[PDB]
């Protein structure tokens, strides 16, 4: 269960870059691909999670995050970032309203999603271990 | 308006305590008093912002955050901390899903809301200035 607090600390230290990536992917995909996931195995990597898979997977003892589907539906990508981390099937909800908001974060980092994916995934490696 | 970034730094570094206070206030008051606000003057201090008051104050040119009212109505306090910082009439949304969730932060920090309020308020003093 320690990976949860490792993921928590990583998010805390990387909110602006995660917001830039969140917003960049929002621009390209909106919600058509589902929810941005961080699958932690075999090493942490960004994925998309269709709403079915989230419900299927929140339908599990270790999870059962109350109203998760509504939280995912009601997230406002212009002001707040939402992702889900996944370690051996258990969800940790990632949600934060950064400063500046995600679209400004995107403009201020000045990186495309490919650049942010590689930078963030390198940073995760060996920092979050399941 | 540097206070927006100082408040962002404060929240990032104090998620557990703010989560414990948020849930302690939920235990005490539920939604009977409105939304938890942080009034930044003369010193940052926690207040309650009734629904009508939030709305009137969001009805101002520096604010007009899209879907603010809906974010407030949909907040899931077992999962999500929600507060609004208020600096010279400027709203800043605070929303984040802590690790562990808010009711566990309250249990783990082992203090009542009076203790939490005093600690968090002294901490913010000097650190977030308008």
Numbering used by the authors:
A (entry chain B), B (entry chain A): 13 to 142
What text appears in the publication on this structure?
In the Nos7120 genome, the ccmS gene is located within the gene clusters expressing β-carboxysome proteins and carboxysome-related proteins. ccmS in Nos7120 encodes a protein of 142 amino acids. As determined by SDS-PAGE and Native-PAGE, CcmS functions as a dimer in solution, with the molecular mass of ∼16 kDa for each CcmS monomer. We solved the 1.99 Å crystal structure of the CcmS dimer in space group P212121 by molecular replacement. Two molecules of CcmS form a homodimer in the asymmetric unit, and each CcmS monomer consists of five α-helices and four β-sheets. The two CcmS molecules are rotated symmetrically, with an interaction interface of ∼900 Å2, primarily mediated by hydrogen bonds and salt bridges. Key interactions at the CcmS dimer interface are formed by Arg16-Glu111, Ala109-Gln107, Pro110-Lys104, Asp20-Glu111, and Lys104-Glu111 residues. These residues are highly conserved, suggesting that the dimerization of CcmS is ubiquitous among various β-cyanobacterial species.
